[PDB]
């Protein structure tokens, strides 16, 4: 079992870490959800599907930068919504093919009530997600650590008399 990003960063058998750079909607209005769909950027495969079934969860997710300071939200993993930051492991997804399959993780993040102005800066680390892989074959338990960086600034528009 190993994983890669659409841009070509890889994490090999046994786990490791990689960086994922994401485009974000540049203005996230109050009450709205900024959606970070990692299933278009992170893909994984099973190296021995004839004999081994791989089980993959989101084990932990932490918030950073502007997301930590100015957003609240959830992570939708394989269709079920969990808190984000996430300290409790999710249900599992089965990987059973040598063909790359998306990792079905999507962040839904809404600005907190005191947000306003620049909330996320380009290049900043905004999230870390731990993909946990086990299987039905041996004792392997591996962590694939995805560092999620913003490709662009995100602003929460404000009102007032200054524009
Ligand atoms: O993907 C099938 C199998 O491949 C390798 O042996 C290791 O990555 C295992 O942990 C995994 O279960």
Numbering used by the authors: 1 to 163
Give the published text:
In K. pneumoniae FimHLD, Y48 and Y137 are ~4.2 Å closer to each other compared to UPEC FimHLD. These results suggest that the H132/S141 residues in K. pneumoniae FimHLD result in a less flexible binding loop 3 that reduces mannose-binding affinity.
FimH interdomain interactions result in a conformational equilibrium between low-affinity and high-affinity forms. While the FimHLD binding pocket mediates direct stereospecific recognition of mannose, the interaction of the lectin domain with the pilin domain greatly influences the conformation of the mannose-binding pocket of FimH.
